[PDB]
Design a protein around this nucleic acid. Structure first.
Lengths: 87, 94, 216, 81, 121, 129, 96, 25, 206
RNA sequence: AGGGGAUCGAAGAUGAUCAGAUACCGUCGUAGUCUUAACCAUAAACUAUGCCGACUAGGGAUCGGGUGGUGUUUUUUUAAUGACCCACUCGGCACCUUACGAGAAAUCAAAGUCUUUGGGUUCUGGGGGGAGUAUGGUCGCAAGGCUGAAACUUAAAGGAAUU
């Protein structure tokens, strides 16, 4: 939130899930942050560079966390043919 | 409070059945509600077949078994120790 | 001495994490009441009441005291904790620790002029604990916290300057209505107000970047 | 699945659903051409005829009524139209 | 009853934990050795501690039991951790150089990796 | 039987959002539903809806982004005046900053803020936020 | 539908159902039936004078032990026999 | 009392009241 | 993407189909598992071994993303993967919970088995429900060797494979160790096969 | 009001047990239990959950119909048909596991989509007794059914669970 002069009021602008856009609550102790290492040419991971994926607690509880992760992985190019939009 | 999903016993979609009679105290109970135990016991008691075999005409081979179905009321089944109470978790067990 | 056990305790003691916001942002679990007081040194305590609870035994009762303690500074943080103990003072001491461990932040807002500082709540938020429901409707400036004295004190330690309140059910149960009110100020960030719609990069967890100062 | 294409279903999914539950409502029946032995006299016969069709030239049963698909006579040949 | 108390039970297991060979397979020889090892203020208590220890000394001879952890348990299983079958490690063996598969499994092979030995059943 | 078409469509949309689904099959079909979807698209609460056309009522498939919270209908369609708009927005919206009461009026289907500027009022359809 | 009519032209049904349902209220029945003007000894009045017929003494109900030192007074307007209560200590001596 | 026995008692009492009623009316 | 050298080689494909890893379960199959590929006449549902490889290498990248190689935790309650976890916990770092997993290693902060992991790799999620349940409370991603019928609750990364067999469980652990070791930078070239036998991770009957 | 009337059996007659037992137990036994024609309009008549419509977590079994698979078995080995196996579909009686969600809880695929309160519609309840009583109507041969109070009295009853 902002006031009239433009400085940013309200603290800790919260994160959102990468599958279904929803604010991750502070006490929502069911949401994990998936980190994927980046390979480059030689086939070795480069420490420090990660592909950050966030999944909310509700998606994990449903059991669609695996389905969502492959969709994001395939969309960003991590995986190739593990997902099918026209199921 | 409610105890079982099947309130009396095994009746969902009928509404009414022909009742049966208990074999012990002659109590009238619904056929579904009654607890039935089948008796497959032999016509002779435990052991004693060898005594029968020696005094048996023909090469034995008879060994008849009596078959009977017994219907017990809730009061008689518990009293006769045929049906015993269980815990709430064990109640759901079939 | 503290000798923290958790990774978060080691990080805050070493001085790596200097704000409670990072833990709130990353939803890092914490069970160490040193962590909360170190990052929030202006942290106060206010006990509503002590209600004994009795369990019947073979010979006499086993009277124990139940105390409700609120922990929270008046600028955006609040926490609640309930614990039973044989001694009333021990229950209060344990209640402070639990309420410290259950410190939650607040999303303040305005009834609206986009002019000053966040006084009321951003949206309407309610929480239910048993049968009691507590509605927190935003209120104009100068209205104040119109509610029961217990929840008014809890909201005054949460940083809210003005709000509207509605309650339904057996509100006389103080513990239930406190927790129900606590959930109400806990779901404020849950609401997705259209201002928080722009996409942002996901921050890397502090533990991942500070794994060197972890364990051993 | 939270992300699936309800707008372009696969062939297998559409062939499995009921005719009233597809993306667009369409029949599952078909029309067949049956010829009596010897004479051609082609005629069109529904899959579920609900009656006993006879070519007007020859008084011969070409199909028998059935609750589901009509059962054609043994001495007949069928072809999709 | 002769049910041993946990005090003599836990101490006896701790004695064998670090002292495999010291406690001999006989009661009298190691009964005084237990006194020399642990600070026991009762002659009766050390008598029962050695009795359970000697009995545990006999049982381990028959075979391993629960809660042994005697600094030598790993010695066999660190030696018995390299079975590594010499040739037939369930690969390129157990058949006539061809893998027995089915029709549907073959369609999986023709997906991307059709260059393999197949034996459709 | 089926009384209102927009009520079923909005209920299905709300259920899909609660189930974390980005799509929902709207199948009572209508023109009010289409217009109700257009005004939602104007404020970005939904994605893209494309209407499947059979020779019957029809079906609508709308892609949902994780920005909608609750969309409902106000049945019966009350005859809300121009001075009662503020009262309705004070009982159906969380805050005055956001939230749009979608009402049907003699100038078409639109939200409460546009009604104030055009100085017209009609029947109340529902609310979106 | 929450068990209630919800049409834009259905107002008589709600109005009628409200009329019968409000009769279950004790205050609604007490006011409209006007039992205070028929059966109430005071007849819808805050005070009522009378004549002290006799001095009375009643015992307390359970968990208690006292004599309340009441009085039986006949109201003037109604002419009904009504028991009263002299509140303060040592106040029966004043009355007669 | 049981509901059946209370209802039977008040029904018999109603019968007695109606029998007394028939004598005057 | 990837340098395209991580595709399923015929050597790895031959190994995977030799242990009957593609052989799934019967009609029991959750709707959350679309990896099934046709169905055998007997009733066994065939799992596409190709989708397993991309999911296997995805897990390897996730494991390699962990900076310190002790937050990785491999848990197994079934006796068919006890040796695989122990060897995986000795070749690629990580701490083993092979055998009994006490209820509270992740939540109770004063216990002698208290650890704070960043990634949990269970063998049978149905048989390791307690480990998954506690991992949910403390915000830790879960990687499971799941089958078509196995539940997917609180499981973020799935590894389609056969869990009703010592051969398949050991092979997946062996392949996961191979991929993660290459990504770390200790197994030199990615083309040369590993110098240890895949049967090392296997569990003997005695 | 007739027919029928074998077992069981409101009443009743006896045998006991018991301080008392016209109750439980035993032996008889009328009305009744069956049916014809005409009445009675009640029940824990309960799934204590009104009817219609839409959406929402999975899994298996089963009933009825339909579809497909050189599927199996069957008569004349092999056509049909029928009976089974597998897959799918529609309507059902239902069931197993979870709890997004609801509830005071017991529990619920609704008892969910209700303080983020609105799909359509009907009926009922406003503390416990008095009381479903009194009276007035109405139906019935009667027994009884429908509608249905007041005076007066009380600070408690009542529901789910914990020790």
């Amino acid at each position: 939130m902002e006031n009239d002069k433009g400085q940013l009021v309200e603290l800790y602008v919260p994160r959102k899930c990468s599958a279904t856009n929803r604010i991750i609550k502070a006490d929502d102790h069911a949401s994990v942050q998936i980190n994927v290492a980046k390979v480059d040419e030689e086939g070795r991971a480069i420490p420090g560079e990660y592909v950050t994926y966030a999944l909310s607690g509700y998606v994990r509880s449903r059991g669609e966390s695996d389905d969502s992760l492959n969709r994001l992985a395939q969309n960003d190019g991590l995986l190739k043919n593990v997902w099918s939009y026209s199921r | 409070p409610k105890k079982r999903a099947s309130n009396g016993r095994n009746k969902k979609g009928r509404g009414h059945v022909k009742p049966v009679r208990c074999v012990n105290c002659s109590k009238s109970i619904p056929k579904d509600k009654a607890i039935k135990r089948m008796a497959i016991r032999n016509i002779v008691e435990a052991a004693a077949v060898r005594d029968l075999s020696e005094a048996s005409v023909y090469p034995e081979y008879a060994l008849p078994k009596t078959y009977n179905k017994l219907h017990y009321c809730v009061s008689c089944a518990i009293h006769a120790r045929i049906v015993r109470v269980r815990s709430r978790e064990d109640r759901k067990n079939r | 001495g503290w000798v923290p056990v958790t990774k978060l305790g080691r990080l805050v003691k070493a001085g790596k994490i200097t704000t409670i916001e990072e833990i709130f942002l990353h939803s890092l679990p914490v069970k160490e009441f040193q962590i909360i007081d170190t990052l929030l040194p202006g942290l106060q305590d206010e006990v509503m009441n002590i209600k004994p609870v009795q369990k019947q035994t073979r010979a006499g009762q086993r009277t124990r005291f139940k105390a409700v303690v609120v922990v929270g500074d008046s600028n955006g943080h609040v926490g609640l904790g309930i614990k039973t103990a044989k001694e009333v003072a021990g229950a209060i001491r344990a209640g402070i620790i639990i309420a410290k461990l259950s410190v939650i932040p607040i999303r303040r807002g305005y009834w609206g002029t986009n002019l000053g500082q966040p006084h009321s709540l951003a949206t309407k938020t309610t929480g239910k604990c048993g049968s009691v429901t507590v509605r927190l409707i935003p209120a104009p400036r100068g209205s104040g916290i119109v509610a029961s004295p217990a929840v008014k004190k809890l909201l005054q330690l949460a940083g809210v300057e003005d709000v509207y309140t509605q309650s339904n059910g057996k509100t006389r149960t103080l513990e239930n209505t406190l927790k129900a009110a606590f959930v109400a100020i806990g779901n404020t960030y849950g609401f997705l107000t259209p201002n928080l719609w722009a996409e942002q990069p996901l921050p890397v967890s502090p533990l991942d970047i500070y794994s060197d100062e972890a364990s051993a | 699945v939270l992300v699936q294409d309800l707008l372009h279903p696969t062939a297998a999914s559409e062939a499995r659903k009921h005719k009233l539950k597809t993306l667009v409502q369409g029949p599952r029946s078909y029309f067949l051409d049956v010829k009596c032995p010897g004479c051609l006299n082609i005629t069109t016969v529904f899959s579920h005829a609900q009656t006993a069709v006879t070519c007007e030239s020859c008084s011969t049963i070409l199909c028998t009524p059935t609750g589901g698909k009509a059962k054609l006579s043994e001495g007949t040949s069928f072809r999709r139209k | 009853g002769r049910v041993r108390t946990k005090t003599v039970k836990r101490a006896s297991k701790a004695l064998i934990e670090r002292y495999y060979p010291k406690l001999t397979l006989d009661f009298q020889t190691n009964k005084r050795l237990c006194d020399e090892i642990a600070t026991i203020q009762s002659k009766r208590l050390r008598n029962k501690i050695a009795g359970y220890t000697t009995h545990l000394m006999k049982r381990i001879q028959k075979g391993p039991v629960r809660g042994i952890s005697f600094k030598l348990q790993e010695e066999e299983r660190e030696r018995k951790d390299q079975y590594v079958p010499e040739v037939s490690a369930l690969d390129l063996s157990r058949s006539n150089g061809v893998l027995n598969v089915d029709n549907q499994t073959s369609d999986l092979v023709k997906s991307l990796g059709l260059k393999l030995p197949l034996s459709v059943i | 039987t089926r009384s209102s078409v927009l009520a079923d469509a909005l209920n299905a949309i709300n259920n899909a959002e609660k189930t974390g689904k980005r799509q929902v099959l709207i199948r009572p079909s209508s023109k009010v539903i289409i217009k109700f979807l257009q005004v939602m698209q104007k404020h970005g609460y939904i994605g893209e809806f494309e209407y499947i056309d059979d020779h019957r009522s029809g079906k609508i498939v709308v892609q949902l982004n994780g920005r909608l919270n609750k969309c409902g209908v106000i049945s019966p369609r009350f005859n809300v005046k121009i001075g009662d708009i503020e009262k309705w927005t004070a009982n159906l919206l969380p805050a005055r900053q956001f939230g749009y009461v979608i009402l049907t009026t003699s100038a078409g289907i639109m939200d409460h803020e546009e009604a104030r500027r055009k100085h017209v009022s009609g029947k109340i359809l529902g609310f979106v936020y | 539908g929450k068990g209630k009519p919800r049409g834009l032209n259905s107002a008589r049904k709600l109005r009628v159902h409200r009329r019968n349902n409000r009769w279950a209220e004790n205050n609604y029945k007490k006011r409209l039936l006007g039992t205070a003007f028929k059966s109430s000894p005071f007849g819808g009045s805050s005070h009522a004078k009378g004549i002290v017929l006799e001095k009375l003494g009643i015992e307390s109900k359970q968990p208690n032990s006292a004599i309340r030192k009441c009085v039986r007074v006949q109201l003037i307007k109604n002419g009904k026999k009504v028991t009263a209560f002299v509140p303060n200590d040592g106040c029966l001596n004043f009355v007669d | 009392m049981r509901a059946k026995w209370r209802k039977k008692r008040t029904r018999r009492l109603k019968r007695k009241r109606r029998k007394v009623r028939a004598r005057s009316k | 993407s990837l340098p395209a050298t991580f595709d399923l080689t015929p050597e790895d494909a031959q190994l995977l189909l030799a242990a009957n890893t593609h052989l799934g379960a019967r009609n029991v199959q959750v709707h959350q598992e679309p990896y099934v590929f046709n169905a055998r006449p007997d009733g066994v549902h065939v799992i596409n071994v190709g989708k397993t490889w991309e999911k296997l290498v995805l897990a390897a990248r996730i494991i390699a993303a962990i900076p310190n190689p002790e937050d990785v935790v491999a848990i197994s309650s079934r006796t068919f993967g006890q040796r695989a976890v122990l060897k995986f916990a000795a070749h690629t770092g990580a701490t083993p919970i092979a055998g009994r997993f006490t209820p509270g290693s992740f939540t109770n902060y004063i216990t002698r088995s208290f650890k704070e992991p960043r990634l949990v790799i269970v063998t049978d999620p149905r048989s390791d429900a307690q480990a998954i349940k506690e991992a949910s409370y403390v915000n830790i991603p879960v990687i499971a060797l799941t089958d078509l019928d196995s539940p997917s609750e609180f499981v973020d990364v799935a590894i389609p494979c056969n869990n009703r067999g010592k051969h398949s469980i050991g092979l997946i652990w062996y392949l996961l160790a191979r991929e993660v070791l290459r990504l770390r930078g200790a197994l030199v070239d990615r083309t040369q096969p590993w110098s240890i036998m895949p049967d090392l991770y296997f569990y003997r009957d005695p």
